[PDB]
Every structure is written in C-alpha cells, then in structure tokens.
Amino acid sequence: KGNAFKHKRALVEHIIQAKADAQREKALNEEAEARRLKNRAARDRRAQRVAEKRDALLKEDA
Amino acid sequence: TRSSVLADALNAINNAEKTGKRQVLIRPSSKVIIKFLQVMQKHGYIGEFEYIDDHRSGKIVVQLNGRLNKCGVISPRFNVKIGDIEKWTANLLPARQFGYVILTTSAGIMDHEEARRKHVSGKILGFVY
Amino acid sequence: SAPQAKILSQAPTELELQVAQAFVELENSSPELKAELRPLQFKSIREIDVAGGKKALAIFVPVPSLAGFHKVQTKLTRELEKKFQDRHVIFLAERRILPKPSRTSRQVQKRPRSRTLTAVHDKILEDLVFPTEIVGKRVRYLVGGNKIQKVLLDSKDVQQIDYKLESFQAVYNKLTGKQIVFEIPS
Amino acid sequence: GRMHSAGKGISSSAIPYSRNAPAWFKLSSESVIEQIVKYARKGLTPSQIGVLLRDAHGVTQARVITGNKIMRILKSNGLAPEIPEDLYYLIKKAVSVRKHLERNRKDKDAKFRLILIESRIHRLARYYRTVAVLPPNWKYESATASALVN
Amino acid sequence: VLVQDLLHPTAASEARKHKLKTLVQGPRSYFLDVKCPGCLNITTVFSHAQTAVTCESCSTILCTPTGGKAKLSEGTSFRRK
RNA sequence: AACGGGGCCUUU
Ligand SMILES: [Mg+2]
Ligand SMILES: [Mg+2]
Ligand SMILES: [Mg+2]
Ligand SMILES: [Mg+2]
Ligand SMILES: [Mg+2]
Ligand SMILES: [Zn+2]
C-alpha cells in the first residue's frame, strides 16, 4: 500500500528473495553456532586431559 | 586536552629555572621526553633526572643547574632536509659558536651537529641553549 | 619410576643434581611436605659470583609452578639456605622473550605484553624478592647517562631478604647489564 | 574539562600501586567469580557488581585477584548484555527525558538537555561501532528506544 | 621555597594533601572487619560504603551509606586491616 | 682522545 511493488511479480520476487535471506542467516547461525559447542566441548575435553592426570599423580605417587 | 606532553614538560623546566628554582616536577613522562632530557643533561644545560614509576605514564624530577636559557619545541614536527638544517640552526640559535637544534632522525634523537657528522636527518623536535 | 632423575630436565649437571637431591631429603618429612612438594619441579640452575663472601644460586622454573613454588618458597629458603651455606638461593622464571619486530624479524604471530623484554625484566625483580610486595619504584638517570633502578621494598617481614640485596643486585646485573639499588620507608 | 557542562571537577577514584594482593584477602579467586555471576545471573550491572563486591565481600578490585575485569568476566561466562551499560544508561536516561518531554513541550531545558544526552549517545555508538562491539547498522532511534529499556 | 626535595618529601605535608596530589596517587580508603551485636561471623566491609551491607543471616544493618565513609550503627567492632 | 662507518654476543 506504500506503492512498494510495481506488479504481482515484483512482490513474489521480493518475498522469495526475502525468505532466501533470513534462511541464509538461519544457516549461518546454525553452522557458526555449531563451532561454539565444538569449542565448549573440545576445549573442555582438554580440561579433563590435564586435570585427570594431576588428580592421578597426587594419588599415583602414594 | 593535553596534546604535546613534551612541550608541557620543557615549559615547566624553562619556567622554574627562569624563576630561580633548581628542581622541577614533570608529568607525564614520554620516552621522547627522556631522550630529549638526555641530550640536555649530557650537554650540561640541565642536571640529573630521576624517572618516577606510577602505575600511570610516570613522572620525572629534573635538577636545574641554572645556565640554561631556553629549552623548547617545534610543533608541528616538520620534515627537515639536510641542507635545511643549516637554515633552521641559523634561525633560533643564539650564535654559530654554541647552541643546539635537536632533531629526530631515523637513527633517533640527537642534536644538529651530531646529525651533521652522521649525515642523517629526520623530523625536527625542539631546541636547547 | 625414578625419583632422582626425573625432577630436572636437560641431562646434567653435578650441581643441578646436588640441589635436586636436597629437595628429596625435604620431600620426606611430615605427610604434607611430600605430595605437595612432589609436583613442584624446576629447570636448570646457574651460579654466579657475589662480591660478598658467598655466591648466588638461581633456580629456574617452568612457571605454571610458581603457583605452588611460592606457596612454599620461604619454607624452603628458611631450609635450603641452611642446607647450602656460602650460597644464596633464588627462585626465577624461565619465561621466553619475543623480540621487537621490524624487517629482519617479520610476518605476524603478534606479541602479547607478557613475553615483552621490558615487561619481563619487571617480573624478574618481582620474583627476586618474592615476599614483600613492592610499594613503589623510580629510576635515576645519571650524569654519565647510565641508570640505577631504585627498587623500593616493603617493610613488614622484609628480614628474609634483609641481607641478600647484593645477590639480587648481582643477579639483575648478570642478566640485564644495568644496575639496581634497594631501599625502604624511613 | 567536562564535555557537556562548564565544570572542570577532578573527583575520581585513585587506584593503589599494587599489581597483586592485598595479603589479608585469602579468598580464592574462583570463589569470587561465582559471587560475580551469582549477582550477574541475578542481573546486576558490572558497574554495580563491583559496588557490592568491593563493599560487602571485601574485594579491592576485580582487575587484580580475579585476573580479569567484571564485564570482561561476564562476557566470558556468556552473560554479556546486548549493548554496553555505557550506551544503555545513556539511552535509559534520554528516553525518560523524552517521555517527560512528551507531556511538557514548553519545558525547553530538557529539550536542550535532550540534545546533550542524544549527542553523547551517537558519539558513543559511533565509537562502539568503530571498535566493532556494535553492528555497523545499529543507529539508536527515538521511538524504537523505549524498547531498549523495556 | 626555592630549592627543595620533590623526590623525598615529608609525609607530614604529603598526608594532609590530596589523594591525587601525593607524589604517587594513593587511596585514602581502608577496609574494616566487622561483626554483629550478637554474632561472631566476620564481614569484610569497605571504609566508604555506597551499599548498606548486611552481616548475612538475621538481616542486620551494619552501616548506612553516606556521602563519604559509611556511618556505622550504634555499636559493633572494626579493625582497619 | 673528541667523532665518524661497518659486524658479533647478550633468550633476537
Ligand atoms: Mg520490489
Ligand atoms: Mg582537568
Ligand atoms: Mg565544552
Ligand atoms: Mg564540546
Ligand atoms: Mg581514572
Ligand atoms: Zn546480620
């Protein structure tokens, strides 16, 4: 109603392209949201590498 | 806002020693203050200075021996050709005999004569006499 | 598992090992002086001449372990200094120093401020004194141009270093080539 | 001196000379952070977190004894807010100065004071945009701002 | 007042000066250690208290905040370190 | 001996 779209085609070609936008950034906040729990895990698996042999070496040296 | 930090220093130096005081409190402390203060003290125009450590940029205390007419600064720090040091030195120095135009070369801080022997040059900084 | 040659690392040497076997004797007394002293080990050791009637003993450390080396420290240096006399015991840090890049040193990997030369030297004079947190500092620029960094030590419980000031002064000279003087509040 | 007023006043906080300690503390830094996020998950601004920590819990500074600084702590724990409290309180104020201005449009001082607060907001946001903490679009706007508080 | 010692000034004049005006700016604030009227548990309270600090359980009032050092309440103890 | 130019070592 603000005369945004010349004809019916330019309205769908905008709608289509619009969905192709927010679903292009839904997949960026999927893939770039995945490496965050990769490095809250792979980085906190290294917290049980360094802390489970220090737990042991306090006990394992008697 | 405080924009030179060096000129704020050489003023306080120049001020008190022209009012008769022997000692001056400088702040903050640039490493460029220090290198200037060096060439000053080593050429006699000032005494010995002691850096002070804050957890800030730090202060200085300079002992004044008298005998210093003016320490000063050229802002902006011009680019200076080599042949154009002669036309600076003739300008602000009291006589061709003594006095020091102190530049900043790529070799680092020095006076105009020390520059002349090395055959270097750079931006201008200040003066001492 | 060999207790005697594990605790160090390169191969050698007869003095570095001698100081190691001294920890071993301190590793058996009481239950808690063993397993707590157990994990704390050290890298190599230097011995440099002090102008007094003694010498300085520098114990380098991998520096995660200054966390626990500090927890004992004075406990050891009220002991290891009885073990070895005519010698002064210090606990240092082997922390690396990355130089200042221009051209002959090139192409990135940054330079965090710890690992910086000047910032590192200020952490050696923090670890030469280890107790007695410094309450202030300053630096004299000479009339010959040279420097004396005047380290202003605390007062409360300074007696542990109250003598070795030469040995701290001699350490920083055999490292940095520039000098030191200490002092107190009057 | 002052940016938007006449005063030159220097009233401030003067931090001691120590890079470690005080000795009397003995409070085990990991216990401190828990108390920080105990307050933060309860939604207290890092400015006012160190207000209670320094007072009630006897922390000279979070800078030392935690190794890290409060909002730079909250950030590492994922409690980092949307906009910094710098802008936030600036907006939080300007909004109320406009709401009060909607009832009084012959109150010209607030109209003039509005321009001061708003200019600060845009200058802060430009900085925050420059150093990337804010999305390069952003751009605080009047009638969408009462959402940034509520 | 012509030549003097800036490096080694007296603490008689330096301690009546301004917090920022000492040769190295010092904090003029301290830290108490406090109890209740009836309780042994020791609170660590800052000399100038903007918050009104509680001693934990039984919700007490240790100090009411002021434009300056907190105004403590009636009676309780303090130790300056 | 005043000064100038070119390289080593010092955690580079
Ligand atoms: Mg369209
Ligand atoms: Mg001012
Ligand atoms: Mg103005
Ligand atoms: Mg203005
Ligand atoms: Mg400040
Ligand atoms: Zn209570």
Side-chain angles (χ1 to χ4, degrees):
Chain A
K1 167 239 212 305
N3 184 25
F5 313 99
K6 167 178 44 176
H7 38 44
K8 175 182 176 185
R9 146 151 41 83
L11 191 271
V12 296
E13 289 190 351
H14 185 265
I15 285 187
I16 297 148
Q17 246 279 26
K19 289 293 179 168
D21 287 5
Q23 208 272 118
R24 188 184 316 198
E25 91 160 22
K26 167 193 167 68
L28 253 50
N29 269 37
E30 274 165 6
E31 62 173 357
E33 199 166 292
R35 322 183 211 94
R36 334 181 307 168
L37 217 271
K38 178 167 301 307
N39 297 37
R40 257 270 205 177
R43 181 198 234 178
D44 277 325
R45 291 191 262 109
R46 191 247 269 125
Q48 236 55 41
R49 310 287 96 182
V50 300
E52 217 84 274
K53 45 63 142 184
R54 199 267 298 109
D55 282 333
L57 263 275
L58 259 175
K59 190 262 129 195
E60 288 180 357
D61 299 41
Chain B
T1 63
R2 196 185 308 242
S3 327
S4 190
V5 96
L6 178 148
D8 256 13
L10 305 208
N11 166 268
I13 290 179
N14 224 71
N15 258 17
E17 203 199 281
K18 282 182 166 167
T19 49
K21 287 77 151 59
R22 298 317 210 88
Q23 68 295 340
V24 118
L25 185 54
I26 299 179
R27 42 154 274 95
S29 170
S30 180
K31 66 181 144 50
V32 198
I33 293 188
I34 302 303
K35 274 296 177 187
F36 208 154
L37 279 172
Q38 285 188 26
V39 194
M40 294 219 289
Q41 153 260 43
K42 107 181 174 190
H43 273 127
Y45 287 102
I46 64 140
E48 81 152 26
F49 46 106
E50 176 164 4
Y51 181 103
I52 300 182
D53 218 36
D54 326 327
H55 282 340
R56 295 82 194 165
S57 311
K59 309 186 180 184
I60 309 172
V61 174
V62 176
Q63 314 295 339
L64 286 315
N65 78 83
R67 111 167 72 183
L68 164 62
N69 296 127
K70 205 178 198 171
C71 54
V73 52
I74 310 301
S75 179
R77 294 177 198 163
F78 283 75
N79 293 299
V80 199
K81 309 268 149 66
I82 270 193
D84 294 327
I85 312 174
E86 170 85 359
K87 288 186 303 298
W88 272 98
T89 52
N91 276 20
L92 57 203
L93 296 192
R96 281 163 70 90
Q97 349 296 351
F98 80 105
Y100 274 130
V101 171
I102 158 163
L103 321 173
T104 299
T105 69
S106 50
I109 309 211
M110 72 190 53
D111 58 75
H112 73 279
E113 273 171 5
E114 186 186 333
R116 161 212 48 179
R117 326 183 200 112
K118 307 161 162 286
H119 205 55
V120 286
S121 195
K123 303 192 196 310
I124 207 183
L125 220 181
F127 56 79
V128 103
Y129 54 69
Chain C
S1 126
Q4 52 160 343
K6 202 136 188 172
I7 198 94
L8 266 55
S9 34
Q10 286 166 317
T13 173
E14 80 151 30
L15 288 177
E16 294 178 17
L17 325 175
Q18 261 189 281
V19 187
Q21 277 260 17
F23 283 81
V24 180
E25 188 271 306
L26 299 154
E27 287 231 8
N28 42 328
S29 172
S30 194
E32 33 75 28
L33 281 334
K34 318 202 172 199
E36 304 173 19
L37 209 284
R38 161 84 286 270
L40 323 177
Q41 68 130 302
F42 55 93
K43 291 183 177 183
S44 60
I45 284 181
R46 208 191 302 188
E47 165 196 342
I48 43 184
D49 250 17
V50 147
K54 339 282 272 325
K55 293 199 194 183
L57 294 181
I59 307 185
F60 302 160
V61 152
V63 211
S65 48
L66 280 183
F69 261 70
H70 287 184
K71 297 174 62 180
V72 177
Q73 200 76 195
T74 51
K75 308 169 67 78
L76 263 157
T77 321
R78 200 153 267 181
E79 233 72 45
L80 268 187
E81 280 192 328
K82 308 186 302 191
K83 257 295 192 305
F84 306 78
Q85 275 303 330
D86 294 28
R87 296 285 197 256
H88 279 156
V89 166
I90 214 62
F91 290 95
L92 293 193
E94 195 123 59
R95 319 148 144 156
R96 234 283 193 273
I97 297 176
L98 269 191
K100 176 160 142 289
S102 188
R103 189 61 197 273
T104 312
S105 307
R106 32 183 150 173
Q107 319 308 329
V108 78
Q109 200 16 253
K110 250 291 179 182
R111 191 147 134 267
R113 237 54 182 263
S114 58
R115 260 73 38 159
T116 284
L117 191 286
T118 40
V120 153
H121 289 192
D122 264 295
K123 306 303 298 303
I124 282 181
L125 260 41
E126 211 140 6
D127 301 333
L128 259 173
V129 298
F130 151 76
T132 80
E133 58 183 11
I134 309 187
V135 202
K137 211 190 308 169
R138 39 219 61 166
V139 168
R140 270 180 66 261
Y141 283 64
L142 254 297
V143 202
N146 50 303
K147 327 177 181 182
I148 293 181
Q149 180 178 178
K150 186 191 180 188
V151 187
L152 313 186
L153 296 166
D154 194 343
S155 269
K156 22 170 284 175
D157 316 329
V158 132
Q159 327 88 356
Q160 284 61 235
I161 67 174
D162 225 310
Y163 44 109
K164 282 167 294 190
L165 298 324
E166 298 168 352
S167 299
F168 314 138
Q169 177 186 25
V171 158
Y172 188 85
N173 178 78
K174 266 319 212 66
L175 309 177
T176 76
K178 53 208 173 182
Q179 293 294 339
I180 297 296
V181 155
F182 305 99
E183 222 186 54
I184 35 74
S186 297
Chain D
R2 275 296 91 75
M3 177 192 287
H4 285 166
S5 72
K8 300 296 189 300
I10 60 184
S11 99
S12 168
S13 171
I15 268 59
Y17 189 110
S18 176
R19 259 52 187 272
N20 51 91
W24 56 282
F25 192 53
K26 312 199 189 308
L27 247 172
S28 166
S29 62
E30 283 70 16
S31 81
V32 190
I33 310 174
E34 291 178 23
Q35 189 56 253
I36 305 178
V37 199
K38 184 177 181 177
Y39 290 151
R41 291 207 149 264
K42 216 187 180 68
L44 292 166
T45 70
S47 293
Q48 77 202 179
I49 280 190
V51 154
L52 281 79
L53 272 201
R54 171 243 285 166
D55 278 20
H57 292 49
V59 196
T60 57
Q61 40 202 7
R63 275 238 51 178
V64 109
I65 78 93
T66 48
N68 285 267
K69 31 202 305 296
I70 310 193
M71 184 223 51
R72 193 178 283 188
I73 292 171
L74 265 79
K75 171 178 178 300
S76 310
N77 292 329
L79 255 297
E82 33 259 48
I83 56 188
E85 52 172 316
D86 274 303
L87 284 173
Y88 187 96
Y89 280 100
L90 266 183
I91 303 177
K92 197 174 188 62
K93 168 167 257 49
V95 173
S96 182
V97 193
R98 189 188 312 272
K99 291 273 184 177
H100 153 56
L101 256 166
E102 267 196 74
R103 287 117 69 200
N104 321 272
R105 275 177 45 179
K106 237 170 65 181
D107 178 40
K108 292 160 188 178
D109 177 85
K111 179 173 192 171
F112 175 73
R113 294 286 143 77
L114 207 286
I115 307 172
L116 288 191
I117 308 175
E118 264 190 7
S119 287
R120 274 176 279 177
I121 301 175
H122 295 106
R123 294 176 68 183
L124 238 196
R126 153 158 47 161
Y127 160 67
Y128 275 141
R129 263 185 300 104
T130 300
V131 290
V133 324
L134 275 199
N137 286 337
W138 212 73
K139 188 194 174 191
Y140 150 96
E141 299 176 51
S142 160
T144 42
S146 303
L148 258 47
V149 174
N150 263 267
Chain E
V1 52
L2 198 278
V3 48
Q4 62 176 359
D5 222 3
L6 329 171
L7 299 155
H8 305 105
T10 90
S13 54
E14 220 77 353
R16 44 97 149 187
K17 235 177 177 179
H18 190 255
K19 37 192 289 185
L20 307 177
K21 257 67 191 309
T22 92
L23 190 140
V24 171
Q25 51 165 236
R28 295 304 170 94
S29 63
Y30 46 97
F31 285 78
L32 299 183
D33 305 83
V34 198
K35 62 158 59 185
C36 286
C39 312
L40 89 169
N41 36 280
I42 40 181
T43 316
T44 39
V45 197
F46 181 55
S47 58
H48 309 61
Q50 326 187 206
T51 42
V53 189
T54 175
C55 216
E56 213 197 276
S57 184
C58 91
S59 299
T60 197
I61 166 68
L62 269 179
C63 45
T64 60
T66 76
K69 299 178 187 174
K71 174 62 49 54
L72 290 159
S73 314
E74 298 193 343
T76 34
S77 57
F78 55 97
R79 186 180 175 262
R80 218 222 203 199
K81 286 143 301 178

